């Protein structure tokens, strides 16, 4: 049967404090506890005792009513606290209604798994419970946990604070550890849920027990370091002892400074998790509940001596544990030590205040004010305890505590909502080495309703922080697409899309359409400039100058002819045939123009018509003359005109059908993806049919010319005609394959036409001009 710390009074209030540590592994069945706790144990015991004494001394609170207490150990364990709560029920209930006074309410425990079952046991008998550290979020279900209240906020805000911290410093690939229980587990689920939305990954979650063996943490480090060196941050909702085990195993295995580790309030500002191992933990960032120090307890606590304390059963044992001695004559001598304590050892040596004492005192004050308000609002007729209040009712007390409004010892008004959750604030401490062999926790940031006010300059002391734990660097630099292996979306591989493909999707590119080149930064497509030989090429210049020379000769010749219509040479020859020849040459030399210019809807069509019409409109007169000279060896001028007009009409009809089959148009040729040209729309048939017609005409010409070769008549005209026909046949045969052997077909055709016209001009115009002149 364990010991209890009691203080008599009219009203009795219970409390569960973990004076001893948790039972070690394989010893749970014996329910035997470990070492004594200095800051989570006895400090809270003395705080409760002094607080109740002080509030008893206060006249304005519970007049004529004295308040007692009953403090019991819980050993941070589930079964032990269940037994102690059953003892609370036994002290109440049968032995009290018909032992000691009934227990009004409890204050504790401080863990989110023990408090749950204690509430389960204490909600059947209607005993309110006010916790001070069980900051889990599964205890805010007032339908299932009806008699539970808190003086601290839940951990749905610690998860937000940790997410904001890990996001503010551009961390993306994080590990994950959490101690098994209803504090680490739910908090880590909340962290995962609110981290998925913000685009922050999780390398691999883990789970370990605080009391796990020495060899169960080496495996945890091995599985945590298997991911190295990609994840240099470990997010923890672990308790203090889990972090202590991690630090010890890191020192044993040799990972001093291997990776930063981020922690919760479980090891916020606790010197009892890094003492002796303060070299491994430098860098960690811990969130803490914002609680200023209290001087009442400091003044009262330091004067305590073991020989003058008649209220705390766990004091002398604590004294020999802290100062490592053995009191000679004390009842709990504990002679397993040596070097007995002097009479000069005091508590003000290495004093460290507990980090959650204001919450304890505020919980006690909240219970007292609930009792006082219900007393003054249920029994107004008397100032004290009246028969209408005997016995006290649990439901009325709960409905009186759910409306608390008062100022705590820290100076802040304490009021919690219908869910029983007082508001709170957070600090972000950093563990680092202030001096040589000197280490400390220093305040850096804060947190209140998302206003994370941190110090980027204070942490890492420079612009070179820890290597950002990111699996993939910002690789999509504007010319590479992103491809994933499919196993994980956190980090990816990079594939450069082709030079014809520009970036459209973050994951894939798309090729530009035909006639469009990807831009310089690959953000879009741009129309390729068109290339056409307008005026600057030397070959068009040579063709133009040759055409100009031929045209000047033709105009001079026709002017000379028109000067005197009647002449011996003019009388012998027919004016109609020479006029037809001149018109054909002029039409051809005009067709040389309007083709070298920029193609249009009408210009290219006119050029195509002319290049076919000119040889047709030219050869007709000469073939008629050859036919007449062959017949010699609608008559005369009438016959010549009829033949010329019939041939012209036939050629015009052929050309009309030619461009009826293929209507004129302008097109953009695509010789390659790099270059785009501008051309007129034309068909091979529209070139072949005039070519075949001219070939038939040339065949008739050469046949008739070879027929009448002997005649020296018409001033020896037969030799000139035969030589002209032979030259024209030769050039036609040479120029037929030229049109299908290069990309300069326009220039070749223009040159061939110009020289073909010039040959006939030189053959026929010069002799008659000489005959006119000399």
């Amino acid at each position: 049967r364990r010991v209890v710390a009691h203080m008599p009074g009219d009203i009795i209030i219970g409390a569960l404090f973990s004076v001893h540590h948790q039972p070690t592994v394989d010893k749970v069945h014996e329910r035997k506890c470990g070492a004594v706790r200095e800051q989570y144990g006895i400090q809270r015991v003395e705080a409760m005792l002094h607080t109740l004494e002080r509030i008893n001394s206060d006249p304005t609170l519970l007049p004529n009513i004295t308040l007692g207490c009953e403090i019991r150990d819980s050993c941070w364990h589930s079964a032990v606290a269940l037994e102690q709560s059953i003892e609370f029920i036994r002290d109440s209930l049968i032995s009290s209604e018909e032992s000691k006074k009934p227990i009004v309410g409890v204050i504790g425990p401080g863990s989110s798994s023990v408090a749950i079952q204690v509430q389960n046991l204490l909600q059947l008998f209607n005993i309110p419970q006010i916790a001070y550290s069980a900051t889990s979020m599964d205890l805010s279900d007032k339908t299932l946990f009806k008699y539970f209240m808190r003086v601290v906020p839940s951990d749905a805000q610690q998860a937000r604070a940790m997410v904001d911290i890990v996001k503010r410093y551009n961390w993306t690939y994080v590990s994950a550890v959490h101690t098994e229980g209803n504090y680490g587990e739910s908090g880590m689920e909340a962290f995962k849920d609110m981290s998925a939305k913000e685009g922050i990954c999780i390398a691999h979650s883990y789970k370990i027990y605080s009391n796990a063996g020495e060899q169960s943490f080496d495996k945890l480090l091995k599985k945590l370091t298997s991911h190295l060196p990609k994840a240099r941050v470990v997010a923890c909702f672990c308790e203090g002892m889990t972090v202590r085990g991690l630090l010890m195993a890191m020192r044993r295995l040799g990972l001093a400074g291997e990776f930063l580790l981020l922690g919760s309030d479980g090891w916020a500002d606790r010197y009892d998790v890094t003492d002796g191992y303060q070299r491994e933990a430098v860098g960690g960032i811990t969130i803490k509940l914002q609680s200023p120090d209290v001087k009442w307890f400091d003044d009262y606590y330091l004067k305590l001596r073991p020989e003058t304390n008649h209220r705390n059963p766990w004091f002398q044992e604590f004294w020999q544990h802290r100062f490592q001695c053995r009191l000679e004559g004390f009842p709990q001598e504990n002679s397993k030590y040596n070097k007995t304590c002097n009479s000069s050892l005091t508590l003000k040596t290495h004093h460290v205040q507990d980090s959650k004492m204001g919450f304890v005192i505020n919980a006690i004050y909240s219970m007292a004010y609930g009792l006082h308000n219900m007393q003054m609002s249920l029994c107004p007729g008397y100032a004290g305890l009246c028969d209408a209040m005997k016995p006290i009712d649990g439901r009325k007390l709960l409905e009186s505590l759910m409306k608390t409004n008062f100022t705590g010892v820290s100076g802040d008004t304490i009021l919690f909502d219908e869910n029983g959750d007082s508001p709170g604030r957070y600090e972000i401490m950093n563990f680092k080495e202030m001096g040589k062999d000197y280490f400390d926790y220093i305040n850096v940031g804060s947190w209140d309703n998302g206003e994370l006010k941190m110090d980027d300059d204070e942490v890492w002391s420079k612009k070179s922080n820890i290597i950002r734990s990111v699996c993939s660097e910002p690789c999509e630099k504007g010319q590479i697409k992103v491809i994933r292996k499919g196993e994980v979306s956190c980090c990816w591989t990079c594939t450069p899309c082709k030079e014809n493909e520009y970036v459209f999707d973050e994951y894939t590119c798309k090729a530009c359409q035909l006639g469009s080149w990807p831009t310089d930064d690959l953000t879009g497509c741009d129309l390729i400039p068109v290339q056409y030989l307008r005026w600057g090429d030397p070959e068009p210049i040579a063709a133009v100058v040759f055409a100009c020379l031929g045209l000047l000769a033709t105009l001079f010749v026709t002017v000379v002819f028109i000067i005197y219509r009647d002449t011996p040479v003019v009388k012998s020859s027919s004016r109609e045939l020479c006029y037809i020849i001149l018109a054909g040459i002029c039409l051809g030399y005009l067709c040389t123009f309007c083709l070298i210019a920029k193609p249009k809807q009408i210009y290219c069509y006119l050029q195509r018509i002319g290049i076919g019409l000119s040889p047709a409109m030219s050869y007709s007169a000469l073939v008629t003359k050859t036919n007449r000279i062959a017949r010699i060896l609608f008559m005369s001028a009438c016959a010549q005109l009829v033949i010329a007009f019939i041939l012209i009409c036939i050629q015009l009809g052929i050309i009309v059908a030619l461009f009826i089959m293929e209507p004129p148009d302008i097109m953009h040729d695509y010789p390659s993806i790099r270059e785009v040209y501008l051309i007129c729309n034309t068909t091979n048939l529209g070139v072949v049919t005039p070519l075949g017609y001219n070939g038939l005409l040339i065949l008739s010409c050469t046949f008739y010319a070879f027929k009448t070769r002997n005649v020296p008549a018409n001033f020896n005209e037969a030799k000139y005609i035969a030589f002209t026909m032979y030259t024209t046949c030769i050039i036609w045969l040479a120029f037929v394959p030229i049109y299908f052997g290069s990309n300069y077909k326009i220039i070749t055709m223009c040159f061939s036409v110009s020289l073909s016209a010039t040959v006939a001009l030189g053959c026929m115009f010069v002799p008659k001009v000489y005959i006119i002149l000399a």
Partner: nanobody, 123 residues
Framework: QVQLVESGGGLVQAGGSLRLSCAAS????????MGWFRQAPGKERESVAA????????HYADSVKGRFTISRDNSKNTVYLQMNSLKPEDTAVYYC????????????????WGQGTQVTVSS
């Protein structure tokens, strides 16, 4: 509260030996230091011996030092005092006491008493 019961005392010839047994009720006996006191008619109460709650430390009065032995057994919930040589001053009534919030010996703040036992020593 837990009750204390005494046994083993009586009348014996001087120079003999005896064993005095003190037993406590309840189940919280493992956390209570136990003191042996004496009281003779016509004089004020006097101290005899003491044993710590955890054991392993014994306190003997100077007047009886070197001849009396004390031991405890928590399993059967008792403390035994082996008394030897039957000194003439032993003819008195012996009390058993329990203290837990004590100070340096012999100041122990006893709060639980017992009926004791009368031991008479012949001449």
């Amino acid at each position: 509260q837990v009750q204390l019961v005494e046994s083993g005392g009586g009348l014996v010839q001087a120079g003999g030996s005896l064993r005095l047994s003190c037993a406590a009720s309840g189940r919280t006996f493992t956390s209570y230091a136990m003191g042996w006191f004496r009281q003779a008619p016509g004089k004020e109460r006097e101290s005899v011996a003491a044993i710590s709650s955890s054991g392993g430390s014994t306190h003997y009065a100077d007047s009886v030092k070197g001849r009396f032995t004390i031991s405890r057994d928590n399993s059967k919930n008792t403390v035994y005092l082996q008394m030897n040589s039957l000194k003439p001053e032993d003819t008195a009534v012996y009390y058993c006491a329990a203290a837990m919030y004590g100070s340096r010996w012999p100041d122990w703040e006893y709060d639980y008493w017992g009926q004791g036992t009368q031991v008479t020593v012949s001449s």
